[PDB]
């Protein structure tokens, strides 16, 4: 009977200075395949490229 | 039968063809959730540039992006009153699951 859902940190924190992002990026990481550390290094090296 | 296929992998070519024939001969509705695709929306006057066998849809690799095309037949003018009647029937198989 639970409803799983994302909750922005901003909706529970009044200190706006320490809240840089939102639900969007987690929603983005949901698309992302589980990443090996080697694959992460490959992403970083490629973006750098 | 509204058959849903979550994982095409492992499926025999025989069972795939048989399910397709079941869709035709027995009016099965086969949702296949495992395809990722990128629709292009064609105008009626540019036709369907790309043709696709059911066989390719059934044996597409799991990670590859398919590229389906779809008509918007809204801009298709009425037939002339004296165009000969069409005894045959235009058919269709593939459809989107979501808008």
């Amino acid at each position: 009977r639970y409803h799983e859902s994302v909750l922005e940190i901003a909706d529970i924190f009044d200190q706006a200075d320490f809240i840089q992002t939102s639900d969007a990026v987690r929603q983005l990481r949901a698309l992302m395949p589980t990443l090996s550390t080697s694959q992460i290094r490959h992403a970083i090296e490629r973006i750098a490229q | 039968v509204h058959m849903t296929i979550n994982e095409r992998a492992g499926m025999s070519k025989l069972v795939a063809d048989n399910i397709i024939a079941s869709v035709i001969k027995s009016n099965w509705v086969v949702d296949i959730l495992d395809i990722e695709y990128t629709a292009e929306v064609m105008t009626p006057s540019e036709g369907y540039t790309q043709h696709v066998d059911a066989e390719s849809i059934m044996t597409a690799p799991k990670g590859k992006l398919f590229h389906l095309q779809f008509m918007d037949g809204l801009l298709r003018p009425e037939p002339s009153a004296f165009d000969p009647p069409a005894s045959g029937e235009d058919m269709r198989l593939i459809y989107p699951l979501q808008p």
Binding site: L31, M32, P33, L35, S36, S38, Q39, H42, A43, R46, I47 | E36, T38, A39, E40, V41, T43, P44, P61, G63, K64, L65, H67, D72, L74, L75
Partner: protein, 49 residues
């Protein structure tokens, strides 16, 4: 007059191939970021999106 459809796409002129981004299929697609290691990536991977 006679415009069959007016879609809103990512501006390909902005998101150039300088940024590694094809947009021709209607979505951004980058060639070598999230990739299997030890094997060639393959064509038209959905991960590219």
């Amino acid at each position: 007059y006679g415009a069959a459809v007016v879609n809103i796409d990512l501006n390909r002129d902005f998101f150039d191939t300088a940024t590694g981004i094809d947009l021709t299929k209607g979505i951004p697609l980058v060639q070598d970021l999230l990739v299997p290691i030890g094997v060639t990536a393959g064509a038209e991977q959905s991960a590219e999106y």
